[PDB]
Short mmCIF file of C-alpha atoms and ligand atoms in Angstrom, two decimals:
data_model
loop_
_atom_site.label_atom_id
_atom_site.label_comp_id
_atom_site.label_asym_id
_atom_site.label_seq_id
_atom_site.Cartn_x
_atom_site.Cartn_y
_atom_site.Cartn_z
CA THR A 7 99.37 122.59 95.69
CA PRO A 8 101.48 119.38 95.74
CA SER A 9 104.46 119.01 98.04
CA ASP A 10 108.13 119.64 96.72
CA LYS A 11 109.80 117.88 99.32
CA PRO A 12 111.94 114.77 97.94
CA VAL A 13 110.34 111.30 99.05
CA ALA A 14 110.58 107.82 98.10
CA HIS A 15 109.10 104.56 99.08
CA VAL A 16 110.47 101.61 97.14
CA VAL A 17 109.33 98.02 97.58
CA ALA A 18 110.97 94.44 97.00
CA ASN A 19 110.35 92.83 93.73
CA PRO A 20 108.12 89.66 95.07
CA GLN A 21 109.39 87.91 91.90
CA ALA A 22 112.85 88.69 92.18
CA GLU A 23 113.52 85.68 94.82
CA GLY A 24 116.82 85.23 96.03
CA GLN A 25 117.76 89.11 95.30
CA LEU A 26 116.37 92.13 96.81
CA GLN A 27 115.84 94.32 94.10
CA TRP A 28 113.99 97.79 94.99
CA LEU A 29 111.08 98.63 92.82
CA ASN A 30 109.58 102.09 92.10
CA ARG A 31 107.16 100.76 89.34
CA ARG A 32 104.90 99.02 91.45
CA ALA A 33 101.49 99.79 92.64
CA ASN A 34 101.96 101.81 95.88
CA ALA A 35 105.40 102.46 95.29
CA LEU A 36 106.74 105.82 94.44
CA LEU A 37 109.65 108.15 93.83
CA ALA A 38 108.84 111.93 93.54
CA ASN A 39 110.41 115.23 93.42
CA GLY A 40 113.75 114.42 91.99
CA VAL A 41 114.33 111.07 94.03
CA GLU A 42 115.73 108.38 91.94
CA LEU A 43 115.85 104.44 91.82
CA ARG A 44 119.16 103.77 90.04
CA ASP A 45 121.05 100.62 90.36
CA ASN A 46 119.10 99.45 92.97
CA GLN A 47 120.10 102.48 94.82
CA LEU A 48 117.96 105.67 96.04
CA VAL A 49 119.59 108.91 94.63
CA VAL A 50 119.12 112.21 96.65
CA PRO A 51 118.01 115.09 94.47
CA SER A 52 119.00 117.83 97.00
CA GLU A 53 120.78 118.58 100.68
CA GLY A 54 118.82 118.19 103.79
CA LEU A 55 117.59 116.21 106.54
CA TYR A 56 116.09 112.99 105.54
CA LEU A 57 113.92 110.44 107.61
CA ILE A 58 115.33 107.11 106.19
CA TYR A 59 113.28 103.88 106.89
CA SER A 60 113.55 100.27 105.76
CA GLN A 61 111.99 97.18 106.83
CA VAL A 62 112.97 93.51 105.55
CA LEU A 63 111.35 90.34 106.77
CA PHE A 64 113.18 86.86 107.24
CA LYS A 65 111.51 83.44 107.32
CA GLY A 66 112.86 79.84 107.88
CA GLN A 67 110.81 76.50 108.22
CA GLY A 68 112.62 75.41 111.37
CA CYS A 69 116.63 76.02 112.34
CA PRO A 70 119.25 74.23 110.13
CA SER A 71 122.96 72.94 111.20
CA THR A 72 124.93 76.06 110.77
CA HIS A 73 124.46 79.12 113.01
CA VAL A 74 122.16 81.57 110.90
CA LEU A 75 122.88 85.33 111.35
CA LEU A 76 120.68 87.74 109.56
CA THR A 77 121.94 91.38 108.73
CA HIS A 78 120.31 94.34 107.23
CA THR A 79 122.19 97.63 106.51
CA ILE A 80 121.34 101.10 105.02
CA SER A 81 124.66 102.53 103.45
CA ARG A 82 125.80 105.99 102.20
CA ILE A 83 127.87 106.53 99.12
CA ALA A 84 128.49 110.37 98.93
CA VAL A 85 130.05 112.10 95.81
CA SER A 86 132.72 113.25 97.95
CA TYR A 87 133.67 109.79 99.60
CA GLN A 88 132.16 107.12 96.99
CA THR A 89 132.46 104.26 99.23
CA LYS A 90 129.63 102.79 101.27
CA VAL A 91 129.34 104.83 104.78
CA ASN A 92 127.04 102.79 107.13
CA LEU A 93 124.00 104.81 108.32
CA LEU A 94 122.18 102.28 109.85
CA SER A 95 122.49 98.50 110.57
CA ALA A 96 121.10 95.69 112.75
CA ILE A 97 121.82 91.90 112.98
CA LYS A 98 119.58 89.09 114.23
CA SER A 99 120.19 85.31 115.33
CA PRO A 100 116.88 83.71 114.71
CA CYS A 101 117.97 80.50 116.05
CA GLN A 102 119.12 79.80 119.36
CA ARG A 103 119.59 75.92 118.60
CA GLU A 104 119.48 73.24 115.67
CA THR A 105 115.85 71.71 115.52
CA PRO A 106 116.00 68.26 117.23
CA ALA A 111 109.98 72.15 113.14
CA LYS A 112 107.77 75.50 113.37
CA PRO A 113 108.11 78.25 111.23
CA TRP A 114 109.92 81.40 112.35
CA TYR A 115 109.69 85.16 111.39
CA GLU A 116 112.60 87.58 111.89
CA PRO A 117 111.94 91.38 110.87
CA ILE A 118 114.75 94.01 110.61
CA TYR A 119 113.62 97.62 110.83
CA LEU A 120 116.01 100.37 110.75
CA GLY A 121 115.10 104.15 110.91
CA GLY A 122 116.82 107.21 111.47
CA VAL A 123 117.12 111.08 110.41
CA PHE A 124 120.40 112.03 108.83
CA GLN A 125 122.12 114.67 106.75
CA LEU A 126 122.21 113.90 103.15
CA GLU A 127 124.04 115.75 100.13
CA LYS A 128 123.23 116.10 96.57
CA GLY A 129 123.94 112.99 94.48
CA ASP A 130 123.96 110.75 97.80
CA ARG A 131 123.52 107.06 96.82
CA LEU A 132 121.43 105.17 99.28
CA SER A 133 121.56 101.22 99.57
CA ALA A 134 119.49 99.14 101.68
CA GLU A 135 121.43 95.60 101.68
CA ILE A 136 120.76 92.28 103.54
CA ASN A 137 123.22 88.98 103.89
CA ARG A 138 120.55 86.24 102.96
CA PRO A 139 118.15 86.92 100.33
CA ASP A 140 117.20 83.28 100.52
CA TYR A 141 115.38 83.97 103.87
CA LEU A 142 113.66 87.02 102.61
CA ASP A 143 109.54 86.44 102.86
CA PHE A 144 107.91 87.68 99.73
CA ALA A 145 104.53 86.00 100.80
CA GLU A 146 102.17 88.75 100.46
CA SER A 147 103.13 92.34 99.68
CA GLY A 148 104.12 95.43 102.13
CA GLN A 149 106.73 93.40 104.28
CA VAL A 150 109.90 94.71 102.56
CA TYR A 151 110.28 98.10 101.80
CA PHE A 152 112.81 100.88 101.83
CA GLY A 153 112.17 104.74 101.69
CA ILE A 154 113.12 108.41 102.31
CA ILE A 155 111.25 111.34 103.31
CA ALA A 156 112.97 115.04 103.49
CA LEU A 157 112.30 117.01 106.43
CA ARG B 6 99.91 132.37 109.52
CA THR B 7 96.41 130.70 109.75
CA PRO B 8 94.91 127.09 110.49
CA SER B 9 96.17 124.17 108.34
CA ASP B 10 93.98 123.21 105.50
CA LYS B 11 95.94 119.76 105.30
CA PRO B 12 94.05 116.59 105.51
CA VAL B 13 95.00 114.69 108.78
CA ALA B 14 93.94 111.85 110.77
CA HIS B 15 94.99 110.30 114.19
CA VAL B 16 92.32 107.41 115.38
CA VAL B 17 92.62 105.64 118.69
CA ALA B 18 91.59 101.98 119.68
CA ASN B 19 88.70 101.48 121.83
CA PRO B 20 89.78 99.25 124.62
CA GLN B 21 86.57 97.57 125.22
CA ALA B 22 85.81 96.67 121.76
CA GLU B 23 86.11 92.72 122.16
CA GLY B 24 87.62 90.77 119.17
CA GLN B 25 87.99 94.26 116.94
CA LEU B 26 90.71 96.73 116.67
CA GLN B 27 88.00 99.51 116.47
CA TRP B 28 89.50 102.87 115.61
CA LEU B 29 87.86 105.73 117.18
CA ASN B 30 88.17 109.50 116.55
CA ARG B 31 85.97 111.14 119.40
CA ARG B 32 88.42 111.02 121.97
CA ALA B 33 90.92 113.29 123.78
CA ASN B 34 94.05 113.45 121.61
CA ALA B 35 92.25 111.85 118.77
CA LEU B 36 91.56 113.73 115.47
CA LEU B 37 89.88 113.92 111.97
CA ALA B 38 90.68 117.16 110.21
CA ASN B 39 89.90 118.62 106.97
CA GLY B 40 87.91 115.96 105.01
CA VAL B 41 89.26 112.80 106.24
CA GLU B 42 86.44 110.44 107.55
CA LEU B 43 86.17 107.62 109.64
CA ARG B 44 83.83 105.26 107.95
CA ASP B 45 83.45 101.56 108.46
CA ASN B 46 86.67 101.48 110.47
CA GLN B 47 88.72 102.57 107.41
CA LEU B 48 90.00 106.26 107.39
CA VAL B 49 88.81 107.81 103.75
CA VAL B 50 90.96 110.17 101.95
CA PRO B 51 89.48 113.72 100.77
CA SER B 52 92.07 114.71 98.11
CA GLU B 53 94.64 113.47 95.83
CA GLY B 54 98.51 113.63 96.60
CA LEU B 55 101.16 112.75 98.73
CA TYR B 56 100.56 111.26 102.71
CA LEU B 57 102.40 110.02 105.36
CA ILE B 58 100.59 106.78 106.62
CA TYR B 59 101.18 105.54 110.27
CA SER B 60 99.83 103.05 112.70
CA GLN B 61 101.15 101.61 115.94
CA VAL B 62 99.97 98.66 117.82
CA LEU B 63 101.23 97.11 121.21
CA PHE B 64 100.48 93.38 121.74
CA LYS B 65 101.12 91.78 125.28
CA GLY B 66 101.29 88.28 126.16
CA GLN B 67 101.67 86.85 129.66
CA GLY B 68 104.37 84.01 129.08
CA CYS B 69 104.83 81.70 126.09
CA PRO B 70 103.14 78.52 125.14
CA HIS B 73 103.19 79.05 117.75
CA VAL B 74 102.38 82.60 118.43
CA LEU B 75 102.54 84.73 115.44
CA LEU B 76 101.02 88.76 115.72
CA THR B 77 100.56 90.29 112.31
CA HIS B 78 99.92 94.21 111.85
CA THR B 79 98.61 95.26 108.34
CA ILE B 80 97.76 98.77 106.77
CA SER B 81 96.04 98.54 103.29
CA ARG B 82 94.55 100.50 100.40
CA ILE B 83 91.35 100.25 98.70
CA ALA B 84 91.23 102.75 95.67
CA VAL B 85 87.79 104.05 94.23
CA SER B 86 89.08 103.22 90.94
CA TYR B 87 90.42 99.43 91.08
CA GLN B 88 88.33 98.29 94.15
CA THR B 89 91.13 95.85 95.48
CA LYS B 90 92.26 95.65 98.98
CA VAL B 91 96.12 96.03 98.44
CA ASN B 92 98.50 95.83 101.51
CA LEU B 93 100.66 98.83 102.13
CA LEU B 94 102.78 98.01 104.89
CA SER B 95 103.20 94.86 106.68
CA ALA B 96 105.05 93.06 109.59
CA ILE B 97 104.86 89.40 110.95
CA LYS B 98 106.35 88.57 114.42
CA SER B 99 106.72 85.51 116.27
CA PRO B 100 107.74 86.70 120.06
CA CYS B 101 108.00 83.26 121.60
CA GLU B 110 106.49 82.69 136.86
CA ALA B 111 105.85 83.36 133.34
CA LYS B 112 107.51 86.48 132.23
CA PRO B 113 105.42 89.00 130.20
CA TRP B 114 106.41 89.91 126.57
CA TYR B 115 105.78 93.07 124.84
CA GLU B 116 105.75 93.62 120.88
CA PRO B 117 105.35 96.97 119.67
CA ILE B 118 104.85 97.36 115.98
CA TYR B 119 105.16 100.81 114.32
CA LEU B 120 104.31 100.90 110.18
CA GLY B 121 104.79 103.84 108.34
CA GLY B 122 105.63 105.34 105.29
CA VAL B 123 105.04 107.85 102.27
CA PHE B 124 102.34 107.24 99.94
CA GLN B 125 100.32 108.62 96.89
CA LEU B 126 96.81 108.33 97.56
CA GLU B 127 93.80 109.06 95.32
CA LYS B 128 90.39 110.75 96.07
CA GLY B 129 88.30 108.47 97.95
CA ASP B 130 90.59 105.92 99.02
CA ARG B 131 90.07 103.74 102.09
CA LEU B 132 92.60 102.85 104.24
CA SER B 133 92.93 100.47 107.00
CA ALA B 134 94.84 99.44 109.79
CA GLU B 135 94.37 95.47 111.10
CA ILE B 136 95.65 92.56 113.02
CA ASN B 137 95.48 89.01 113.43
CA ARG B 138 95.15 89.05 117.08
CA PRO B 139 93.06 91.60 119.27
CA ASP B 140 93.19 89.33 122.16
CA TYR B 141 96.93 90.34 122.50
CA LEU B 142 96.26 93.91 122.29
CA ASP B 143 97.50 96.13 125.25
CA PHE B 144 95.84 99.05 126.58
CA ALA B 145 98.05 99.60 129.88
CA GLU B 146 98.49 103.35 129.02
CA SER B 147 97.06 105.80 126.58
CA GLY B 148 98.94 106.12 123.18
CA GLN B 149 99.75 102.73 122.63
CA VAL B 150 97.70 102.03 119.82
CA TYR B 151 96.87 104.23 117.02
CA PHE B 152 96.43 104.87 113.24
CA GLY B 153 96.99 108.21 111.15
CA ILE B 154 97.73 110.17 108.27
CA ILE B 155 99.41 113.46 107.17
CA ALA B 156 99.16 115.25 103.96
CA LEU B 157 102.76 116.49 102.79
CA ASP C 10 107.74 129.80 108.17
CA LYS C 11 106.45 126.90 110.31
CA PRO C 12 107.54 126.01 113.97
CA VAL C 13 109.78 123.14 113.85
CA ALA C 14 112.31 121.14 116.42
CA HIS C 15 114.69 118.35 116.19
CA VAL C 16 116.25 117.61 119.50
CA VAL C 17 118.89 114.76 120.17
CA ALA C 18 120.11 113.14 123.28
CA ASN C 19 123.70 113.97 125.16
CA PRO C 20 125.90 111.16 124.92
CA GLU C 23 124.81 109.86 132.07
CA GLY C 24 121.38 108.70 133.89
CA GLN C 25 119.46 111.15 132.05
CA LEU C 26 117.81 111.17 128.50
CA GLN C 27 118.44 114.91 128.12
CA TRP C 28 117.79 116.65 125.09
CA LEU C 29 119.89 119.13 123.19
CA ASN C 30 120.17 121.88 120.61
CA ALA C 38 114.78 125.92 116.31
CA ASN C 39 112.19 128.22 114.98
CA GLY C 40 109.45 129.51 117.55
CA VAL C 41 110.02 126.57 119.50
CA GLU C 42 111.54 126.70 123.16
CA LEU C 43 113.35 124.00 125.08
CA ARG C 44 112.84 124.66 128.99
CA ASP C 45 113.47 122.20 131.50
CA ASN C 46 113.85 119.10 128.90
CA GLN C 47 110.53 119.91 127.06
CA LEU C 48 109.86 121.34 123.61
CA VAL C 49 107.14 124.30 124.24
CA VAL C 50 104.59 124.86 121.62
CA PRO C 51 104.77 128.32 120.12
CA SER C 52 101.08 128.70 118.58
CA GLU C 53 97.79 126.57 118.12
CA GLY C 54 97.49 124.09 115.53
CA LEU C 55 98.33 120.95 113.93
CA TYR C 56 101.54 119.27 114.73
CA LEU C 57 103.68 116.37 113.86
CA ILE C 58 105.33 114.88 116.60
CA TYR C 59 107.76 112.00 116.52
CA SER C 60 110.64 110.45 118.30
CA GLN C 61 113.03 107.42 118.43
CA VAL C 62 115.28 105.71 121.36
CA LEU C 63 117.38 103.11 121.31
CA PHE C 64 118.28 100.35 124.28
CA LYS C 65 121.27 98.16 124.31
CA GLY C 66 122.01 95.09 126.80
CA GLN C 67 125.22 93.74 127.31
CA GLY C 68 123.22 90.56 128.22
CA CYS C 69 120.13 90.27 130.48
CA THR C 72 115.46 91.50 137.28
CA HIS C 73 112.66 91.07 134.65
CA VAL C 74 113.20 94.42 132.47
CA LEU C 75 110.33 96.52 130.76
CA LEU C 76 111.87 99.31 128.36
CA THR C 77 109.09 102.06 128.07
CA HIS C 78 109.09 105.26 125.79
CA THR C 79 106.42 107.96 126.02
CA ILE C 80 105.72 111.27 124.85
CA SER C 81 103.21 113.13 126.75
CA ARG C 82 101.34 116.21 126.49
CA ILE C 83 101.52 118.77 129.53
CA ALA C 84 98.51 120.95 128.53
CA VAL C 85 98.08 124.54 130.24
CA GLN C 88 96.63 122.23 133.54
CA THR C 89 97.42 118.42 133.30
CA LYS C 90 99.89 115.69 132.04
CA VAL C 91 98.80 112.79 129.70
CA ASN C 92 100.18 110.13 127.23
CA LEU C 93 100.12 111.16 123.57
CA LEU C 94 102.11 107.93 122.20
CA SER C 95 103.72 105.18 123.94
CA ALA C 96 105.08 101.63 123.90
CA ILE C 97 106.80 99.25 125.97
CA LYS C 98 109.33 96.57 124.80
CA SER C 99 110.75 93.62 126.58
CA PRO C 100 114.10 92.71 125.40
CA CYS C 101 114.83 89.41 127.45
CA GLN C 102 112.38 86.29 126.95
CA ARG C 103 114.93 84.60 129.60
CA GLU C 104 117.66 85.42 132.33
CA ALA C 111 126.17 86.98 127.32
CA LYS C 112 125.18 88.15 123.76
CA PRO C 113 124.25 91.67 123.06
CA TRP C 114 120.82 92.94 121.82
CA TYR C 115 119.40 96.20 120.57
CA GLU C 116 115.93 97.37 120.73
CA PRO C 117 114.56 100.45 119.35
CA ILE C 118 111.21 102.13 120.05
CA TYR C 119 109.82 104.37 117.60
CA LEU C 120 106.88 106.95 118.40
CA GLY C 121 104.88 109.11 115.81
CA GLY C 122 101.80 110.92 114.75
CA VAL C 123 99.45 113.97 114.08
CA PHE C 124 98.24 116.11 117.10
CA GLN C 125 96.01 119.16 117.64
CA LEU C 126 98.04 121.60 120.19
CA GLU C 127 97.70 124.88 122.18
CA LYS C 128 100.23 127.59 122.54
CA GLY C 129 102.13 127.06 125.80
CA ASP C 130 101.63 123.14 125.56
CA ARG C 131 104.68 121.35 126.49
CA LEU C 132 105.63 118.03 125.08
CA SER C 133 107.83 115.51 126.88
CA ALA C 134 109.78 112.61 125.59
CA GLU C 135 110.63 110.11 128.31
CA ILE C 136 111.99 107.05 129.43
CA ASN C 137 111.91 104.24 131.94
CA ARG C 138 115.55 103.00 131.79
CA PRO C 139 118.23 105.88 130.95
CA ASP C 140 120.65 103.06 132.49
CA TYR C 141 119.80 100.99 129.02
CA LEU C 142 119.83 103.85 126.51
CA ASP C 143 122.84 103.70 124.09
CA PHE C 144 123.66 107.07 122.73
CA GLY C 148 120.70 109.28 113.92
CA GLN C 149 118.95 106.89 116.28
CA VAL C 150 118.03 108.69 119.55
CA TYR C 151 116.00 111.91 118.83
CA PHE C 152 112.45 113.82 119.48
CA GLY C 153 111.27 116.67 117.19
CA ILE C 154 108.06 118.50 116.03
CA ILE C 155 106.98 119.95 112.54
CA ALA C 156 104.17 122.58 112.13
CA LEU C 157 101.83 121.35 109.19
C1 LIG D 201 108.29 106.51 108.09
C2 LIG D 201 107.35 107.43 108.98
C3 LIG D 201 106.19 107.75 108.80
C4 LIG D 201 105.48 108.50 109.28
C5 LIG D 201 105.68 108.75 110.58
C6 LIG D 201 104.68 109.76 111.38
C7 LIG D 201 106.91 108.53 110.97
C8 LIG D 201 107.31 108.63 112.53
N1 LIG D 201 108.77 109.26 112.60
C9 LIG D 201 109.67 108.78 113.37
C10 LIG D 201 109.86 107.47 114.04
O1 LIG D 201 108.78 107.19 114.96
C11 LIG D 201 109.94 106.45 113.02
C12 LIG D 201 110.95 106.24 112.18
C13 LIG D 201 111.13 105.03 111.06
N2 LIG D 201 110.01 104.37 110.95
C14 LIG D 201 108.88 104.36 111.75
C15 LIG D 201 108.82 105.26 112.90
N3 LIG D 201 110.91 109.35 113.03
C16 LIG D 201 110.30 110.66 112.60
C17 LIG D 201 111.03 111.70 111.95
C18 LIG D 201 110.24 112.69 111.08
C19 LIG D 201 109.21 112.53 111.02
C20 LIG D 201 108.39 111.39 111.61
C21 LIG D 201 109.03 110.28 111.93
C22 LIG D 201 107.73 107.74 109.92
CL1 LIG D 202 97.55 108.71 129.93
#
């Protein structure tokens, strides 16, 4: 008998270069037991503890003049407070200095366990989609597992 | 009430398989239960359904010299016969001070009877086996 | 129905777990109430205020009823060099056959670096 636990693993659309579009319709991506992907946001079907997790990968060929600051954030939009509450966040400076030009790879991973309500809208956002790496699949994903 | 019918696996790396990330099930605290097979370094699924899938690898380099470390979990379905990646991480880490990069990949997936999950790296030379529990691969049916 | 625990860190000098089904928490360790398959997991977060070559280790070990052994373990190294802040999480998790009365500890080498949803330890019976 299949599991009744809400789950979801959405992935970046690799053709949507310049955005971070989460897909559920894509091979090895998934929504189940009530979880929805609406408006680039996961929608929690029922209260409980969820494991939330996301990976994003950044890439640049060399370091430019302006300082590069990469951020990744999992936000929450509750029905009783319909403004983004940050759940998880992290920030990486992949460049110490400007190149006087080998390629760099900055992943950002966020995971934790949080209490969610029914109708919670979860988003996972980055500041610089132009540095996202869609070179092969599996690298950029966002997902939840009810515990 | 009784023991669990759920398919599961937790396989561990062989520290003396050179140039290989060789997964093993016959070890203490390792495990293949309820139809999960380890076949050609690939865990094989016995039933359709939702599974958690996870792997840890830990690389270590004594200092730096352009180093890239990749860790990749991938699916082959009976039906499609194509090797698709499920989760993937690329990392550039760089006396000579020793560095450590753990890479933990995990997620929830919808698998089909007879899929062949595999967990791989680009650089086995950089694997660390300092202690036990450092390098591993498994699935857990929900 | 099934044994479960989710314990978290108290926000000095100790990673101490705080607080439920069949599962006790004697002496900073989860105590398995019966034989079977368990999904054991944890996370911890280290933060530095700027960087002694430091290695942050996090380890979940089984104390089987009579020795003590690593189940899951990782080492991070935050600094490549000797005042910018850094954050470094370590993730552990996997599925394990276990005995009634086994103890599961989740430890760190440097409590001094710990930065107290990101610092937990738990189990779930399958
Ligand atoms: C997504 C996923 C799939 C399978 C497993 C076994 C895990 C490991 N896990 C962890 C933590 O180590 C973690 C978190 C985020 N991403 C990677 C690891 N925290 C957990 C809490 C509950 C269950 C498994 C938990 C995580
Ligand atoms: Cl050990």
